[PDB]
Amino acid sequence: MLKKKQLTVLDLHPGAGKTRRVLPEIVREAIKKRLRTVILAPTRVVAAEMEEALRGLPVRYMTTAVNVTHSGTEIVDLMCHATFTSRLLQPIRVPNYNLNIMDEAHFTDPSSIAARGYISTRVEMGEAAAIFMTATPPGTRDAFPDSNSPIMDTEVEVPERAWSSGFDWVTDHSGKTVWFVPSVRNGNEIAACLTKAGKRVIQLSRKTFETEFQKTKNQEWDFVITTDISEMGANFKADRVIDSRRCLKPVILDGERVILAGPMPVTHASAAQRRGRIGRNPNKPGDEYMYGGGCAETDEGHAHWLEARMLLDNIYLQDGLIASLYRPEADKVAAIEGEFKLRTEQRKTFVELMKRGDLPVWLAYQVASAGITYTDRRWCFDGTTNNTIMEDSVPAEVWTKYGEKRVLKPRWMDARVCSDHAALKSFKEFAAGKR
Ligand SMILES: Cc1ccc(CS(N)(=O)=O)cc1F
Known about the structure:
By secondary structure, the protein is α/β, with parallel strands linked by helices. Among the domains are: 7-133, P-loop containing nucleotide triphosphate hydrolases (Rossmann fold, 3-Layer(aba) Sandwich), CATH 3.40.50.300; 152-291, 3-Layer(aba) Sandwich (Rossmann fold), CATH 3.40.50. It has helices spanning 18-32, 44-53, 81-89, 110-124, 168-172, 184-196, 209-218, 268-275, 303-313, 344-355, 361-369, 421-431, and strands spanning 7-10, 37-41, 59-61, 76-80, 99-103, 129-133, 151-155, 177-180, 201-204, 223-226, 240-243, 246-253, 257-265, 287-291, 390-391, 394-395, 397-399, 405-407. The chain has a six-stranded parallel β-sheet with strand order 1-6-5-2-4-3, sandwiched between helices. It is globular and about 60 Å long. The structure holds 1-(3-fluoro-4-methylphenyl)methanesulfonamide. 1-(3-fluoro-4-methylphenyl)methanesulfonamide (UR7) binds at residues 60, 62-63, 70, 79, 83. 1-(3-fluoro-4-methylphenyl)methanesulfonamide binds next to loops. It is found in: Host cytoplasm; Host endoplasmic reticulum membrane. This is Serine protease NS3.
């Protein structure tokens, strides 16, 4: 694996021990061969679990999620996928790592796709090696891979709303259930229904994941209600997955706006990762996978691949060259390599709108490419009437940094800034100049 110009896909089935058994072997070999190595974890939760798997090996944990005193001598770095892409974008020295290891390399967030495109391009240039660790590499067509113990797969109608009758099998279960929902809002409704039926429910989503995931260890629970974030190496002591088989797809319409289309079917990779949460204990056969729809390749035309091109266009590689997407996922977008390359000051604004602004990549790009500066929030209020953001079925209002009450009406509408109460809260704070 460790020879230059090599990219290896380590595609052992879910729970085969890629993280706890194979990764420490790779890291030991890399240290023996004096390869400057990066390990990319999808989440702070996984970074902390990797520290346990690698404990004693000289690894620099480039995250506050890990409480360790470093030697200062480590040649192996661990950081999040997003941190890798972030440091590449910023005026910060990123070592030209000899060996690039991506764990949960199926992750479809824009910064993960961008990281794969950067790494795979360095490998194609002959500059580096890489190992992509995932049961479900891009384009996989198998939603039912092998497991540590047999799984009972059942196609069944799964509720996506509160129910009064017709789903007794959901609440009649005496074990622990992980339930994949298409959105935070849909999980909120199902969670309230289960809570009303006497169930103990934990909800996970991207924004809440580190805090709330700890509750799955610290308290007794009957259901975890989660979005697709729990596809990225989140482990549960559960005996059932309920899978809507549905997700939201951000879609750019007419180059002008982003909508959250669907819900619609997940990919085969996503379905296999959702299922893969159970069947993991070779001593506990008969874990259950209840699935409520088919799979489809909904990654095609998904905004994350275009957003990944916006990130890669603004990462220095060599002179004017630009990193390509990882070949197996490169057809998911129709973009011209370099079309999103910004001049120095607009690139800095783009980065800050993502990093401090917490804006979606697409929206950060519209603002930065318009020549607007980071603190100039006039664009949050001067859009078309149809870009009016609603709160409780009336136009949302903020006090501008000038002290004027104004309707939230962004010049560019990205549905991700108001897809749930927390997102809208954060975007109101942005529009008000509060960060
Ligand atoms: C040991 C260590 C901790 C944190 C960071 C900051 S980062 N890379 O998360 O932006 C760097 C480090 F070198």
